[PDB]
Structure 1
Amino acid sequence: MSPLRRVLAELNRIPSSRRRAARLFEWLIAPMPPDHFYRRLWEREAVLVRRQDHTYYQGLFSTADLDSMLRNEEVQFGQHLDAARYINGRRETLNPPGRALPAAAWSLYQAGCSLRLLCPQAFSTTVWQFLAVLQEQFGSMAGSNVYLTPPNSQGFAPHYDDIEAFVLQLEGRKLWRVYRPRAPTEELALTCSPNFSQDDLGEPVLQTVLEPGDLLYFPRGFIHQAECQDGVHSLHLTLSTYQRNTWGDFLEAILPLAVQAAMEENVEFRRGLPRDFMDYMGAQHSDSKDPRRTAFMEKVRVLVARLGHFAPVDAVADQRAKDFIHDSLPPVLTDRERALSVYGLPIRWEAGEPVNVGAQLTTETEVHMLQDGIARLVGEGGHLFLYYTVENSRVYHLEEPKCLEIYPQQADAMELLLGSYPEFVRVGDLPCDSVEDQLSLATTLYDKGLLLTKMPLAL
């Protein structure tokens, strides 16, 4: 059995989704220890993992899969697939409007174009599970693109991306060149870069030929490019994560709330500005020797520093968690998880009627969240809402934010369930005022596909 299939079988036998995610990432960069990778290389260095095992990714994705999805699925140029080529130091995109049929796509490939599938996880369930698991240990949306390049060609101009990238060589070989950030500002860049010409580039910090099974990681800001040399194409899947998930992004959400809080709670923020500060402040006075100006700037720095005491850090953390739940790919259940959840209840249609009717929860039922990263409790305008991922589309933001309200008499028990995973809790022992509230919370979550039971319900 291939390493990918072996580890996937292995994950199905691991109870915790948190541990499953950790294990899969361990597999992704093996033999490199994750602890070393995050401590020393994550967001700092380009890394090549020379696998010396061409079968490592077998089962993940292949060119055969691509060809088949073009004929059996509704793959559209632009929306789902791009065809580009880099020649004469110039990038060109050749997307014809409409459906990308095998005849058109392969015609472009034959003429030198690279093909790029934007959301492979929407057409492949393997890629979907792969990213759905890894997103749990990234704490960030895990996206991906698939790149197929014909022999003796380059599809894209050198550039840098706005995400942490993990390149997985699936077929053929490709000559890659990775450059360290060209300048202080391009280090851990915020946005994708424009296309660069070779003259804009220095020396590669990494130049090598990737072999199926190999892994090549590099931070946002690291310029890269790649080309197929004589006689063989290249197919690779680039896993991406950490888009706009910086400390600066956290502050962006924090500040407006902090200053509002400060103004409402401390009179020093409500005092009026000088009646004549326009006399010494402004670009026209950037060189004024007026001390009132120095006093103005000093006061500004003091009040700003002060805002730290008014920052609603927990509320912004919850908001980001809520947006991540919305961004999330839906969970891929283990056979056990499905079997012990509403998804696996044996009730279906036979002969002329429903069979295996009406299993019901009781105070004796032992439960716990279906998985660790599928829900988040959030407070908004006096109400509490549990946002979950189980009804999200494999397509980014196709379905809108899903939640269900959690009533006050259930908040303690909901927090408990969210923090004890994967420990089982007898429904009767949930911190609720009445038994009606215990059964009601457990029933609502279970019916939602957010909970699983120790023993399959059979009532």
Structure 2
Amino acid sequence: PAWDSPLRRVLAELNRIPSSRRRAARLFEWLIAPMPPDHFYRRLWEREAVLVRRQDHTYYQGLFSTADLDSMLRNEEVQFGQHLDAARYINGRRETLNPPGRALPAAAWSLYQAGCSLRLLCPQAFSTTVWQFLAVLQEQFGSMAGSNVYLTPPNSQGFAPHYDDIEAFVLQLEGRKLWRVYRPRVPTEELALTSSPNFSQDDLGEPVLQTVLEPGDLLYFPRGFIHQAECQDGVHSLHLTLSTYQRNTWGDFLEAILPLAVQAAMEENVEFRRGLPRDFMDYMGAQHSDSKDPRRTAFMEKVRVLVARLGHFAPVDAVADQRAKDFIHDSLPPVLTDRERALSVYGQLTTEHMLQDGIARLVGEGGHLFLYYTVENSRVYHLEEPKCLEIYPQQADAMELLLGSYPEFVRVGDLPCDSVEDQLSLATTLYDKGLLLTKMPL
């Protein structure tokens, strides 16, 4: 019997699936199993919270353990604040207790002992298993996948009730914790855009979901959904919560669209460049909130039709590209399979495909062309400034093909350039930067 924890099983499996994309689907299919991904997104994602009773306390064995924390605190410069917070919720308040500087096992555990909950901002940096997990999942999210690990001692609550500004996937890892989740309390909170203030017990009402998680379980809920948790009994609780979809709304897309749309409208269409009525302020202003004038209301219309006309002028593509750019510079660097590694520079070449599917994007800025890529990003968010390189027009077509036709191999001498000077400097540059894998080791 090849394997022991379905995590280790499925992880090994991904190393045997050749398409980074396909790997990405898979892992998520696993994450919410038995449930279909397709049914989840269509009806549940952003719609409702979700418990997955796994029945398998060993489901996640290998991802992260109390031990792995204990090592980290010993073997790495874990700093209170920057990497680790000590939290308490008692008598209805939260108290944070971060002794300045360095977070040593001694101190950490002595805080844990005093009822504090331990929260590890960024264990993707230190654990390479978590790193992989995220870096695979983020490719099917089209949005940064981040994660924190929470440890709560017996008979204590770490944090107050609140709603985040992200989609949360709680994975129970060890122990048992009593959760209470709530549906958005009012229209304006449904899919909220800002973390909420710390709420008290009167502030809320009756939960839609109230469960005790056990290792292997998964609990998911959309942003705006309030939630609190606690240890009871005598057992510790460990969980990793995965999070994404921060600032990834149509709204936030529109914000960028519109300013450029109006600029365009103004340069290209003259109606946008005409002068306002001269006496418009005789009927427009808070001061005339209530004018009977029937040109108060024509003005109002003209603003709407003109606003509607902007739909036509909006650089929809140009902004999609710019958001991707941000996802790239936002992304955790790729976890390679063994096959990929070996075929790549990480493991010469001649006129006889893409390293992975989600590591690079081509983006025209200022009549130029830049290929932005992930493969030199830290395992800390934005610790690296964005990384690109300049494509010259001659090679644009080729580069576009390479990205559009993964995972299909292409002969270097079938890359639609002008010359064979081009075809070689493109595959050469790409290959060295770790963007490109060969079918036979060079």
**TM-score of the two chains, using structure 2 as the length reference:** 0.98
Q: Could you tell me how far 1:361 is from its partner in structure 2?
A: 1.2
SS of the equivalent of 1:171 reads strand
Paired residue secondary structure (2:240): strand
Of residues 224, 228, 231, the one that matches 1:228 is 231
How many angstroms apart in 2 are the aligned matches of 1:10 and 1:174? 31
Shift of 1:257: 0.8
Question: What is the Cα deviation at residue 145 of structure 1?
Answer: 0.7
Question: What are the Cα deviations for residues 316-364 of structure 1, in whole angstroms up to 9, with x where unaligned?
Answer: 1100011000100000000000000000xxxxxxxxxxxxxxx91100x
Once the 2 structures are TM-superposed, how far is the Cα of residue 238 of structure 1 from its aligned partner? 0.1
* CA-to-aligned-CA distance 1:384-415 (integer Å, 9 cap, x gap): 00000000011000001000000000000000
Cα separation, 2, equivalents of 1:183 and 1:76 = 38
- Hey, what's the Cα distance between the residues in 1 that align with 2:152 and 2:282? 62
2:130 & 2:422 partners in 1: Cα distance?
A: 40
> What is the DSSP-based 3-state SS (H/G/I as helix, E as strand, rest coil) of the residue aligned with 1:161?
coil
Worse overlay, 284-293 or 391-400: 284-293
Corresponding residue for residue 348 of structure 1: none
Displacement, 1:131?
A: 0.1
Q: CA deviation at 1:275?
A: 1.8
Q: Distance in 1 between matches of 2:18 and 2:98?
A: 45
- In the TM superposition, residue 274 of structure 1 has moved relative to its aligned partner by 1.7
Following superposition, the deviation at residue 279 of structure 1 comes to 2.0
Deviations 1:170-190 (A, max 9, x none): 010000000000000000010
SS at match of 2:296: helix
Q: Distance in 2 between matches of 1:245 and 1:430?
A: 35
* Counterpart in the other structure of 1:328: 331
Q: Distance in 1 between matches of 2:146 and 2:284?
A: 47
CA offsets per residue over residues 154-180 of structure 1, 9 Å max, x none? 010000011100000001000000000
**Higher mean C-alpha displacement, 112-121 vs 269-278:** 269-278
Determine if the alignment matches structure 1 residue 383 to structure 2 residue 368. Answer: yes
SS in 1 for 2:170: strand
Q: CA deviation at 1:287?
A: 1.2
Match of 1:361 in 2: 349
Q: CA deviation at 1:276?
A: 2.1
Distance in 1 (CA, whole Å) between partners of 2:253 and 2:437 is 34
Return the offset for 1:281.
Answer: 1.3
Once the 2 structures are TM-superposed, how far is the Cα of residue 196 of structure 1 from its aligned partner? 0.4
**CA distance in 1 between partners of 2:282 and 2:86 (Å):** 58
Q: In the TM superposition, what is the alpha-carbon distance from 1:95 to its structure 2 partner?
A: 1.0
- Comparing 276-285 and 51-60, the one that deviates more: 276-285
CA RMSD between the two structures: 0.9
Partner SS for 2:362:
strand
Which stretch of structure 1 is more off in the superposition, 273-282 or 6-15? 273-282
How much does 1:251 deviate? 0.4
Between 277-286 and 368-377, report the one with greater CA deviation.
277-286
Aligned to 2:415: 430
Distance (whole Å) between structure 2 residues aligned to residue 179 and residue 387 of structure 1: 40
Structure 1 residue runs of 5 or longer lacking an equivalent are 344-358
Secondary structure of 2:55's partner?
coil
Alpha-carbon shift at residue 96 of structure 1 (Å): 1.2
**3-state SS, counterpart of residue 85 of structure 2:** strand
Q: Does 1:107 align with 2:114?
A: no
Of the three residues 63, 67, 72, the one matched with 1:69 is 72
Tell me the CA shift for residue 225 of structure 1.
Answer: 0.3
Q: Distance in 2 between matches of 1:330 and 1:66?
A: 22
In the TM superposition, residue 278 of structure 1 has moved relative to its aligned partner by 2.0
Distance 1:17 1:179 in 2: 36
Secondary structure class of the residue paired with 1:322: helix
SS across alignment from 2:341: helix
User: How far does the alpha carbon of each residue in 1:406-427 deviate from its partner, in whole angstroms, 9 at most, with x for none?
Assistant: 0000000000000000000000
Return the offset for 1:21: 0.5
1:97 shift after superposition: 1.1
Distance in structure 1 (CA, Å) of the matches to 2:304 and 2:39: 39
Write the distance in 2 (CA, Å) between the matches of 1:314 and 1:159: 36
User: Could you report, residue by residue, the CA deviation over 1:239-292 in whole angstroms, capped at 9, with x for unpaired residues?
Assistant: 001001001011011001111100011000001112222222111111121222
Aligned-residue identity in percent: 99
Deviations 1:34-66 (A, max 9, x none): 011111110001100000000000000000010
Q: CA deviation at 1:103?
A: 1.1
Residues in 1 aligned to 2:329 and 2:292: alpha-carbon distance in whole angstroms: 53
Q: Secondary structure at the match of 2:437?
A: strand
Shift of residue 202 of structure 1? 1.1
Equivalents in 2 of 1:123, 1:188: separation in Å?
32
Q: Which runs of 4+ in 1 moved over 6 A?
A: none
Q: How many residues align?
A: 437
1:238 and 2:241 correspond: yes
1:453 is paired with a residue whose SS is: coil
C-alpha distance in structure 2 between counterparts of 1:99 and 1:156, whole Å: 22
Question: Any residues of structure 2 matched to 1:153-172 within 5 Å, and which?
Answer: 153-172=156-175
Counterparts of 1:122 and 1:272, CA distance in 2: 57
Mapped partners of 1:233, 1:360: distance in 2:
55
Name the residue aligned to 2:50.
47
User: Partners in 1 of 2:290 and 2:96 — Cα distance?
Assistant: 50
Secondary structure in 2 matching 1:387: strand
Counterparts of 2:239 and 2:300, CA distance in 1: 53
Identify the range of structure 1 (271-280 vs 218-227) with the bigger mean alpha-carbon deviation.
271-280
Does residue 175 of structure 1 match 2:178?
Answer: yes
SS at match of 2:318: helix
Q: Secondary structure at the match of 1:208?
A: strand
What is the SS of the residue equivalent to 1:342? coil
For residues 40 and 429 of structure 2, the distance between their equivalents in structure 1, rounded to whole angstroms, comes to: 41
| Partners of 1:33 and 1:132 in 2: CA distance | 21
- Determine the C-alpha separation between the residues in 2 that align with 1:383 and 1:420: 23
Deviation at 1:126, TM superposition (A): 0.5
Distance 2:96 2:294 in 1: 58
Question: Within 2, Cα distance between the matches of 1:280 and 1:92?
Answer: 54
Whole-Å Cα distance in 2 between the matches of residues 370 and 11 of structure 1? Answer: 15
